[PDB]
Ligand binder design. Structure first.
Ligand code: FAD
Ligand code: 3PE
Ligand code: RBF
Ligand code: FES
Ligand code: FES
Lengths: 396, 195, 446, 201, 407, 248
């Protein structure tokens, strides 16, 4: 009995132990790399980013709470939110003198619920599709879930996260056959569903800092409003230096803020060959070229025109999207020249949306989705040129 | 100049296919092969760039209110005066291509039948009428709308060619998965909505 | 001359000693039906029949006039047939020395023989099966002709014999075979070798090309792609150096030459080395008393591209010049996919093994994962040196799109060409079978 | 009765055929506009089919498109005048797609495939049935879109909104382009699962 | 005032558009009648005005092209060799024509639109199509649902056919009742059981269908057909009965039947290999034509076996002919397998399905079944079972020849 | 037979022509009333007058609302067909419109009509308030609205955004009754006779003379509204006209 659950059971059995399968034909010796190890390597690549994102979210929330409230009032609000008094019960302190431990604990209280909800809901959808279609559960959902959980504001409602992951898994991935058979990015598909369906909870000033009753614009919005001079952290009253943005001491999503942790993880995966360095190089080339062009043109009314390329790199989710989202192999182009073109398009589109699109302060997700739509066309151009070479016998 | 802004508006910011759901029947039908989709894109470009200016002239010289006789406007003859002109021009283009340009007829004239009185062409002309456009502006808008529609259809054709490897659930195979793909395409294309 | 930079040299422990010795006496030989592409046998012998050295055993229905002759003289013991009565193999027990002789010529006239005479002698002796048309890896038709015959004088397959060692002892036969091929070919003969010097044919038709690099450089398909690109209307023949020696011996002594030098190797071979055997030698007897205890898999040919040597198929292949014995990796490891791979080989750099350069791995037959959808990470481009888009072609093969696969260059590939792509596939796709299915579909529809 | 209901689920113009998609993704944002569009399409298609059947014997055949568009455009213009006279707000909401009814592929499909080779009465009834099926798809998509994007059905508050002291947070995506695409795709999925004969090979 | 001005502008615009279209048509489209060369003979060149399909123009001329599905491009019996013209091959044709034949130039005339000069190389068989108004000799019942139609050709002439070929019978508008059929009491058991006499067939327009011959070439002056009654299926009784089948079963001695041809593509291979014949129902008609043609005309010594599947003893026929052939020819044998023998049959021979009997008794012990040439024709279920069994035996599809009746 | 084809197409294009032209011309008069009643109902709503049904709307609009034309440059009443004035069309023509420069175009409108239309709401024989149509560029599309100013010329009695394309929930809150009602009692100008209406981000202080809470999480639409009210109350907008109203 319980045959209906076999698809899930095997997933556990294969997860704990490697299968005892042996090659039946073709090459009798296979490479040690498998989809499981690739997915787990990508999952571990964002661990530094996830941990620093938790720490940064906790620090920002504590600083904002201390800057807004004090004395008995603070206690009241600490008792009004389950995150705050749950942190208190676990040994953490909400006072300004809190150490890294309390900040990380608060970041965990804000992130672990979102990650758990996303994992459970997306896994339910994936396993439902697999059992109903008699497929074997794939390991791509691990990366999808972690990445989706690391690209949402710390204050995103749990039900909104569930809806977003459901859209990203079912509509964008499962209906196309599942892992390795879709053309769009599931995590960014869900994030865009939340972006366009519930813009209030994933945009503005009240969602990027976990302190209730605190309204603070991020670095990108502040730059758009008043340029480099407007980059001021209201919670602490200190200007946001470029080093602060690079390290990740700024408001934002969990794990997007730190360009250093993302750089470390991206370097590891790129060295391992999991992530295509061509796509990253193309994104860098496009962003640098378009940013320099806009700087040269300049603009007396739009401050975004004067943002240097290195400020584009360290602000918003550009680093996270370039490393862990633009490098999604299934949605990316399958040709090296196509990969270069795809990366250049991603970078150019992100810079364009950042600069000349008032509605969206950041355009990394939209740029990636747009380039996902057109990667097949770059592949088509490359293969057509290759076929033209072939029909000429390569000039032999 | 303002013409470049209008062209970019008609291609990216205002996409006739995804932003306005015009030509979906043909856009979701012949979007199986990149070659045929590209051919229909060229056909749409030609038909739009020939119809938008001609209909602009007809509207600005005949159908414009208080333009022939003071106190009379022939605005109620807009839809038909545009549809008939579109059909006549499409058929005339087909015939001239088949007689003088066999290669162009096969490359372009084959796809005209579908384009005849197509939804996208009438949508573009009616949007031109709904706004105030000069002849040069009308030409630029028509060409840009045609190029944007070609871009959308060619991108969808490439996506379907890539999807050839996909394992779509039965029932979603064909039209349903194409509809979901078009929805995702619009989700991606809304990036220029705020521009 | 031509250098290959994209490829993968498998460092499997147990490289042959590259010294030719005398192998175990073989009292059983066989011809494998499935070894030949698109062959429907018409049997000419039955169990218990007495056959001579080069007596026809079965004919080809799809290739009229092509004769598959016995490799040795003896008594047919069995005709193993599998599913759908597919001819798995024909087995002959060696006995006696009766042989079928042919015309013999001196070495100074082999370049001036009529093409039809060469074709008739080759077909009658059954050596014509050595050739393979690249577009479909089939035996060329009797009446057909090719303007590019590729002599694969190099073996870059893992645990493969050194062709130089074999050729140095049969230099006269190799030169005679080169002259015979030069006369036979309508155009030119391409001797694809390494930098090491080999016997040279004075005929201007024969041209020597040096290929240097990882394993793919040593495959015939790569040589044709780099010298004589093949298509539907451009067919190039392929033959290995040992078959060229056989042709030379056939046209010099007038008798079929079935002696071969095969590298017995693998992690479980006590004394890996080159051994002399006969065509289709029984691998069970060949590897007797030369294997470590345990459950092992014997493979005819390279591990990347070979046939399991078990039961009816436990016989040397016609086009296989190497025996590779591996361990059966049926053991299940706890979190084996999450451990630092000090002893794990991979094209990617996700294991510690790549850090220790010069290491040798006791690779087993384990798939190192489960079946999953293709998720490109650039491995195919890394291991494919041909001017193709490997990822999209492999997607075409997986999706069964025969037309798109052909447009991308599926016609120029053999099952051996995609062996590396199968090796480095994270999803564990056997691209050889998919390519063979697509090519069979193309042949049927064409 | 069989022919009237045939194009509702068995031969739906949008699920099986791909005719009439352009209007479906635009006027479904509100149930009022969707329903008025269903009525307009039914009326125009039925009357055009009847007239084309009445003139299905003596037509140029050289300007076929011009003649079969003249009747359709006259009917659509009359319908536009009525809609701008009665239900002016609905006409404004429909914006330009009121005109597009001439190019709506359903009307031509049933003018050429049926009205040109059928008696006027069966042609009219077939047009009514095809309009009914198109309106069924339109009303389903519009019901879901309006309910999940504004918590209102036909302008009547069904789900109280937080902005109005309610409990439901409107889903903005239902008011944008992709929602209609996804809803049509999933409705096609459901229809083809309940009617496997329509599954495409 | 506004109404009049709008009306005149409307008329002007429409008239200008249609006039432009008409003038362009006149000046651009060559109205000159197209000319198609048939087989390269100037006499057979056909001059036809532009418009319509190639099949209609060919039928108008003296060359008739076999067609079953008509103007739908579905059956594929109207293949023609278009050396030049006709444009590319449309997607529907490829479903019935392979890529290699497309390279050769095989195209569907019914699907090919005649719009420009074309060159055709129609074969002699298609070129040499003749019609006859034969007289019905007898239409007796050889089984429960099979009738033997014997036709005397006018003037004693013979159809120049080949064994395994078929002709096309044409019937005009008519009305027949199943009660009028002359069914002997011996074969009326099932008819009474299922009340098959209730059905009536009405045809309003002339129709044409294909039917194979049961006589071999030297059987001069006669055409023998084994026609099955295509009664409505038991699960769908109210659907109309078979048109042509009912019409032929309504024919009697002295009636005039219009036939055309000869046609056919299922022909014996010219080889010395053994031949295995498998027959079911109406398949006896073509099948007979082969065996006799192999012994009476060709006098071939090839080893030949025949295996017919049936339900009961009464379902069998032609027993005397095959028995005489077997007695007079030691290289030919034949067997009949009854799936459900009746008590009155007193049967003691092979029982069950034909494929199972053939496999168990003959092919199982056969040393080289793949080397035999298999001709087979019967009901679709028998056809599928036999093909699957043979494929499981390793027989390639080329050695398997199927005369699919489309049942 | 080209003759028969031409004759039949001519007859068709005559009969359908008659039908279409008669339908269009006959309903032309009704098309005007139906189009006008929408704006009339909006004026009644902003004016504080309740009306339901077309007949009641037209009756009350004619009884209580007096449309008039005002010259922005001089801020004085002018004579014309105010009831049948199309400010949108006028702004698009150089004859009745002026091109605004970057500095003056605070509301991001390309052209400003020379003569605008206001609506005097008169409780009796004297005007009780004035409804001004003010429009400005938002984040997504031009937003048009009616602002009710008391006879004093400084107090705003109501506001309604009758045409605005914005994201519902974020930018569509201009249609929210609470936010619009928050404008009642606010003062447009300060003591110096300078624009003072301000949309405070994050919530204006309670009781502020000129502070109105902005749209939550919609700073861009709120900025558009602020620019609209700053430009239309400036020298080039309704400023001079409001000064004349202040002095009578
Ligand atoms: C090369 C060739 C050779 C042939 N040789 C022979 C031969 O020797 N002998 C022979 O008998 N036939 C032969 N046929 C088949 C023959 O052409 C006819 O297909 C067959 O005889 C049926 O004749 P019919 O027109 O009366 O049946 P049809 O009129 O085609 O009827 C088909 C069946 O479907 C049923 N039906 C009709 N309408 C419906 C409906 N709406 N729903 C469901 N069921 C319906 C009918 O009752 C009948 O049972 C041959 C065909 C080919 C192509
Ligand atoms: C608003 C938009 C959402 C609308 C939701 C309502 C419409 C849903 C229509 C579902 C129709 C399919 C269900 C029946 C079916 O066929 O399911 C099985 C399907 C294919 O399975 P198959 O390959 O045929 O199985 C082979 C072995 N029997 O494979 C399956 O397992 C399908 C499982 C159903 C998935 C439904 C997902 C609904 C939620 C997605 C939208 C989320 C938005 C946020
Ligand atoms: C380098 C790499 C990056 C990935 N990035 C993403 C991602 O950004 N979002 C996601 O949903 N899945 C991601 N995946 C998982 C998976 O490849 C992806 O969902 C495909 O689109 C479908 O399998 C990634 C996998 C790899 C190996
Ligand atoms: S494309 Fe068919 S309705 Fe517009
Ligand atoms: S008549 Fe059937 S294919 Fe032409």
């Amino acid at each position: 009995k319980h045959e209906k659950w076999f698809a899930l059971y095997e997933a556990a059995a294969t997860l704990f132990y490697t299968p005892g399968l042996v090659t039946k034909r073709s090459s009798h010796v296979r490479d040690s790399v498998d989809l499981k190890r690739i997915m787990i390597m990508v999952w571990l690549a964002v661990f530094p980013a996830m941990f620093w994102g938790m720490y940064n979210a906790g620090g920002q929330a504590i600083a904002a709470l201390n800057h807004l409230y004090s004395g008995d009032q603070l206690a009241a609000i600490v008792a009004g939110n389950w995150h705050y008094w749950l942190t208190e019960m676990l040994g953490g302190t909400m006072s300004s003198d809190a150490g890294w431990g309390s900040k990380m604990l608060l970041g965990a209280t804000y992130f672990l619920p979102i990650y758990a909800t996303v994992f459970i809901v997306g896994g339910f959808w994936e396993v439902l599709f697999c059992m109903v279609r008699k497929h074997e559960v794939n390991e791509g959902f691990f990366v999808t879930s972690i990445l989706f959980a690391l690209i949402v504001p710390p204050t995103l409602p749990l039900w909104q996260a569930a809806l977003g992951i459901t859209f990203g898994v079912v509509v964008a991935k499962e209906v196309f056959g599942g892992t390795g058979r879709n053309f769009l990015n599931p995590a960014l598909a869900g994030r865009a569903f939340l972006f366009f369906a519930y813009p209030a909870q994933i945009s503005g000033d009240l969602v990027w800092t976990a302190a209730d009753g605190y309204s603070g614009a991020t670095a990108l919005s502040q730059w758009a409003q008043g340029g480099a001079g407007a980059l001021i952290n209201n919670a602490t009253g200190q200007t946001i230096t470029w080093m602060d943005a690079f390290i990740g001491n700024i408001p934002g999503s969990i794990g997007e803020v730190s360009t250093l942790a993302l750089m470390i993880g991206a370097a590891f995966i790129v060295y391992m060959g999991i992530a295509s360095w061509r796509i990253i190089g193309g994104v860098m080339i496009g962003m640098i070229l378009l940013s320099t062009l806009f700087n040269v043109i300049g603009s007396d009314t739009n401050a975004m025109f004067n943002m240097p390329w290195h400020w584009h790199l360290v602000l918003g989710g550009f680093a996270f999207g370039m490393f862990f989202m633009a490098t999604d192999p299934v949605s990316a182009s399958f040709t090296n020249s196509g990969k270069w073109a795809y990366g250049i398009l991603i970078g150019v589109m992100c810079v364009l949306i950042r600069v000349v699109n008032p509605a969206y302060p950041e355009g990394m997700m939209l740029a990636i989705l747009f380039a996902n739509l057109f990667a097949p066309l770059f592949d088509h151009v490359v293969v057509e040129r290759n076929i033209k070479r072939r029909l000429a016998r390569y000039g032999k | 100049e303002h013409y470049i802004s209008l062209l970019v508006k008609s291609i990216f910011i205002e996409n006739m296919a995804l932003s306005f759901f015009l030509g979906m029947c043909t856009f979701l039908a012949v979007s199986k092969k990149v070659k045929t989709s590209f051919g229909l894109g060229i056909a749409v470009i030609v038909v739009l760039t020939i119809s938008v200016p001609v209909n602009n002239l007809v509207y600005n010289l005949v159908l414009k209110p208080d333009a022939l006789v003071e106190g009379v406007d022939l605005s109620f003859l807009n839809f038909i005066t545009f549809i008939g002109v579109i059909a006549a021009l499409v058929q005339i283009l087909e015939m001239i291509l088949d007689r003088f340009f066999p290669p162009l007829y096969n490359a372009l004239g084959i796809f005209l039948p579908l384009i005849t009185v197509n939804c996208a062409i009438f949508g573009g002309v009616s949007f031109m009428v709904q706004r105030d456009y000069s002849f040069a502006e009308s030409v630029v808008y028509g060409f840009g709308s045609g190029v944007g529609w070609m871009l959308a259809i060619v991108a969808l054709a490439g996506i379907r060619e890539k999807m050839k490897y996909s394992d779509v659930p039965p029932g979603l195979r064909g039209l349903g998965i194409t509809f979901i793909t078009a929805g995702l395409m619009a989700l991606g294309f809304m990036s220029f909505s705020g521009v | 001359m031509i250098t290959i930079k994209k490829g993968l040299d498998l460092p499997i422990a147990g490289t042959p000693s590259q010294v030719i010795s005398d192998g175990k006496a073989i009292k059983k030989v066989a011809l494998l039906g499935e070894e030949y592409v698109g062959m429907r046998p018409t049997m000419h012998v039955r169990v218990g029949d007495e056959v001579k050295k080069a007596q026809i055993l079965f004919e080809d229905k799809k290739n009229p006039g092509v004769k598959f002759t016995s490799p040795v003289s003896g008594k047919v013991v069995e005709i193993n047939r599998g599913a759908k009565r597919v001819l798995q193999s024909v087995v002959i027990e060696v006995a006696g020395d009766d042989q079928v002789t042919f015309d013999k010529f001196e070495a100074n006239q082999l370049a001036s023989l009529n093409r039809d005479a060469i074709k008739t002698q080759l077909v009658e002796s059954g050596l014509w099966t050595a050739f393979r048309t690249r577009p479909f890896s089939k035996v060329p038709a009797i009446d057909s002709t090719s303007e590019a015959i590729f002599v694969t004088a190099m073996d870059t397959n893992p645990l493969a014999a050194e062709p130089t060692v074999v050729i140095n002892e049969q230099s006269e036969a190799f030169v005679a075979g080169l002259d015979v091929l030069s006369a036979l070919t309508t155009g030119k003969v391409y001797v694809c070798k390494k930098g090491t010097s080999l016997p040279r044919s004075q005929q201007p038709n024969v041209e020597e090309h040096v290929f240097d690099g990882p394993h793919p450089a040593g495959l015939a398909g790569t040589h044709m792609h780099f010298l004589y690109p093949v298509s539907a209307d451009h067919v190039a023949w392929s033959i290995n150096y040992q078959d060229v020696i056989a042709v030379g011996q056939l046209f010099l002594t007038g008798e079929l030459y079935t002696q071969r030098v095969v590298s017995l190797a693998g992690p479980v071979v006590n004394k890996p080395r080159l051994v002399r055997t006969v065509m289709g030698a029984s691998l069970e007897q060949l590897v007797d008393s030369e294997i470590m205890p345990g459950e092992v898999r014997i493979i005819s040919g390279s591990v990347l591209s070979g046939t399991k040597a078990t039961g009816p198929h436990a016989y040397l292949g016609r086009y296989h010049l190497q025996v590779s014995v591996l361990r059966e990796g049926r053991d299940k490891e706890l979190f084996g996919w999450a451990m630092p791979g000090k002893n794990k080989f991979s094209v990617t750099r996700s294991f510690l093994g790549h850090l220790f350069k010069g290491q040798v791995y006791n690779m087993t037959t384990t798939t190192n994962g489960s079946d999953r959808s293709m998720v490109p990470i650039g491995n195919y481009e890394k291991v494919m040196p041909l001017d193709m888009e490997p990822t999209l072609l492999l997607r075409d093969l997986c999706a069964g799109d025969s037309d798109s696969a052909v447009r991308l260059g599926a016609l120029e590939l053999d099952e051996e060409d995609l062996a590396l792509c199968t090796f480095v596939c994270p999803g564990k796709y056997e691209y050889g079978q998919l390519l063979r299915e697509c090519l069979d579909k193309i042949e049927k529809e064409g | 009765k069989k022919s009237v209901l045939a194009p509702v689920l068995d031969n739906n113009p949008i699920a099986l055929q791909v005719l009439g998609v352009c209007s479906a993704l635009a006027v479904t944002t509100k149930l009022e506009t969707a329903f008025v569009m269903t009525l307009a399409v039914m009326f125009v298609t039925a009357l055009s089919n009847f007239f084309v059947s009445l003139i299905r014997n003596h037509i140029p055949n050289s300007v076929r498109i011009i003649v079969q568009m003249a009747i359709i455009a006259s009917l659509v213009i009359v319908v536009d005048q009525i809609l701008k006279a009665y239900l002016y707000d609905i006409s404004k909401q429909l914006s330009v797609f009121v005109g597009l009814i001439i190019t709506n592929c359903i009307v031509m499909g049933r003018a050429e495939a049926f009205a040109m080779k059928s008696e006027p009465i069966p042609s009219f009834i077939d047009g009514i049935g095809n309009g009914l099926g198109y309106g069924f798809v339109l009303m389903t998509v519009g019901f879901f879109r309006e309910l999940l994007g504004s918590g209102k059905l036909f302008g009547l508050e069904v789900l109280p909104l937080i902005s109005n002291g309610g409990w439901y947070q409107p889903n903005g995506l239902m008011l944008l382009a992709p929602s209609a695409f996804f809803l049509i795709g999933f409705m096609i999925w459901a229809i083809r699962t309940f009617k496997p004969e329509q599954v495409e090979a | 005032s506004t109404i009049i001005f709008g009306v005149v502008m409307f008329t002007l615009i429409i008239l200008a558009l249609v006039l432009v279209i008409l003038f362009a048509k006149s000046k651009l489209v060559p109205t000159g009648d197209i000319t198609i060369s048939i087989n390269g003979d100037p006499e057979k060149a056909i001059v036809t005005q532009p418009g319509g399909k190639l099949l209609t123009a060919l039928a108008g001329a003296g060359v008739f092209v076999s067609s079953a599905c008509g103007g739908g491009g579905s059956c594929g019996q109207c293949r023609v060799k278009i050396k030049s013209g006709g444009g590319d091959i449309l997607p529907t044709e490829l479903d019935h024509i392979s890529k290699g034949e497309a390279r050769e130039g095989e195209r569907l005339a019914c699907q090919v639109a005649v719009k420009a000069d074309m060159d055709l190389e129609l074969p002699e068989e298609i070129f040499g199509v003749k019609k006859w108004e034969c007289t019905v000799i007898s239409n007796d019942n050889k089984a429960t649902f099979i009738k033997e139609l014997k036709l005397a050709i006018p003037d004693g002439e013979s159809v120049p056919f080949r064994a395994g070929g078929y002709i096309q019978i044409e019937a005009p508008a008519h009305h027949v009742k199943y009660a009028d059929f002359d069914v002997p009491e011996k074969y009326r058991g099932d008819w009474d059981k299922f009340n098959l006499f209730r059905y009536e067939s009405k045809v309003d327009e002339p129709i044409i269908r294909a039917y194979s011959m049961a006589n071999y070439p030297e059987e001069f002056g006669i055409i023998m057909l084994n026609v099955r009654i295509a009664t409505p299926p038991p699960n769908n009784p109210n659907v109309p009965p078979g048109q042509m089948s009912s019409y032929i079963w309504s024919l009697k001695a002295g009636d005039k039947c219009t036939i055309s041809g000869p046609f056919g593509e299922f022909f014996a291979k010219d080889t010395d290999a053994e031949m295995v014949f498998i027959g079911g129902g109406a398949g006896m008609a073509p099948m007979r034509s082969h065996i006799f043609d192999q012994l009476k005309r060709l006098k071939s010594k090839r080893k030949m076996s025949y295996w017919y599947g049936a339900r009961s003893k009464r379902e069998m026929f032609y027993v005397e002919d095959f028995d005489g052939l077997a007695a007079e020819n030691d290289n030919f044998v034949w067997h009949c397998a009854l799936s459900d023998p009746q008590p009155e049959d007193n049967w003691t021979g092979y029982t069950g399905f034909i494929h199972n009997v053939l496999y168990e008794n003959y092919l199982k012990d056969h040393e080289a079944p793949e080397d035999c040439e298999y001709y087979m024709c019967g009901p679709p279920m028998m056809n599928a079972a036999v093909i699957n069994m043979l494929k499981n035996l390793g027989v390639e599809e080329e050695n398997i020849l199927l005369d699919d009746f489309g049942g | 037979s080209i003759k028969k084809t031409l004759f039949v197409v001519i007859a068709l294009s005559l009969v359908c022509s008659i039908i279409v032209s008669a339908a269009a011309v006959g309903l032309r008069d009704k098309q005007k009333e139906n189009a006008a009643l929408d704006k009339q109902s909006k004026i009644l709503q902003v004016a504080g007058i309740e009306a339901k049904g077309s007949k009641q709307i037209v009756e009350l609009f004619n009884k209580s609302i007096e449309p008039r034309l005002v010259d922005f440059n001089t801020g004085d009443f002018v004579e014309g067909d105010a009831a049948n004035y199309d400010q949108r069309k006028a702004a698009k023509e150089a004859s009745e419109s002026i091109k605004l420069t970057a500095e003056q175009d605070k509301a991001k409108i390309q052209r400003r009509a020379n003569v605008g239309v206001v609506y005097l709401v008169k409780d009796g024989d004297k005007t009780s308030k004035v409804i001004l149509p003010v429009h400005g560029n938002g984040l997504w599309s031009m937003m048009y609205a009616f602002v009710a100013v008391e006879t004093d010329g400084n107090t705003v009695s109501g506001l309604t955004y009758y045409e605005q394309g914005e994201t519902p929930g974020l930018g569509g809150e201009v249609e929210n009754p609470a936010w619009r009602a928050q404008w009642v009692g606010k003062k447009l100008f300060d003591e110096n006779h300078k624009p003072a209406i301000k949309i405070v981000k994050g919530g204006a202080p309670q009781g502020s003379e000129h502070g109105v809470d902005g749209l939550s999480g919609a700073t861009l639409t709120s900025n558009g509204v602020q620019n609209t009210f700053d430009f239309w109350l400036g020298d080039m907008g309704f400023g001079p006209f409001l000064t004349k109203v202040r002095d009578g």
